[model samples]
Target: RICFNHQSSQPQTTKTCSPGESSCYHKQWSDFRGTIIERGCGCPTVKPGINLSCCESEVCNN
Candidate 1:
């Protein structure tokens, strides 16, 4: 699942996917850069993916 937050001072968001789930967060923006800044999973054996972006607008771009 993908979640979005605009109240953060940083330009990033988080996403969590199940072991068998295949999904991607789709963000729409023009002239921007997106990156995975942090990652952690609740499971000790699994890792979560954190994403960040710098855009002309406030949004994530996939």
Candidate 2:
């Protein structure tokens, strides 16, 4: 899992996912204290059977 903390007048965000597999990307807005206020994820592409061929076929429990 990937964790990100950001503080800005603009927006802040982060992305996290099971290791070895494609991560779900995200973005968000935070306060000056780095508290998350708003967030969103990057659109993921639809790929079938991709996980089957991955070198590591285990599902992460994070």
Candidate 3:
């Protein structure tokens, strides 16, 4: 599947994932930088205070 692959502060981009990485994920959180966002192929472990969204369709992590 195709998924978004960049941080919120950078220009948005997309990537084609391998067969094993069928899932796409987007995450949002806060820190000294105020707010941070990340999108990529495959879902990471969940953490407290992070808002995460995951999907299996093309470019769905945006």
The top-ranked prediction according to TM-score is 3
RMSD value for candidate 2? 12.2
lDDT of 2 by residue, 1-61 (tens): 4432232235444445345443332233334666332222222443452221111112221
Candidate 1 or 2, higher TM-score?
Answer: 1
Per-model TM against the reference: 0.24, 0.20, 0.85
Ranking by lDDT: 3, 1, 2
| Over 4 Å off, model 1 | 1-10, 27-61
Task: Give the Cα error of residue 24 in candidate 2, in Å.
Answer: 6.4
Q: Regarding TM-score, does 2 or 3 come out ahead? A: 3
Model 2 scores a TM of 0.20
- Model 1 Cα shift for residue 5 (angstroms): 7.5
The TM-score measured for candidate 3 stands at: 0.85
Clashes of 3: 0
CA RMSD for every model? 12.3, 12.2, 1.3
Model 3 agreement with the true structure over 1-62: per-residue lDDT tens digits = 89989998798899988887889999999999788899989988989999989998889987
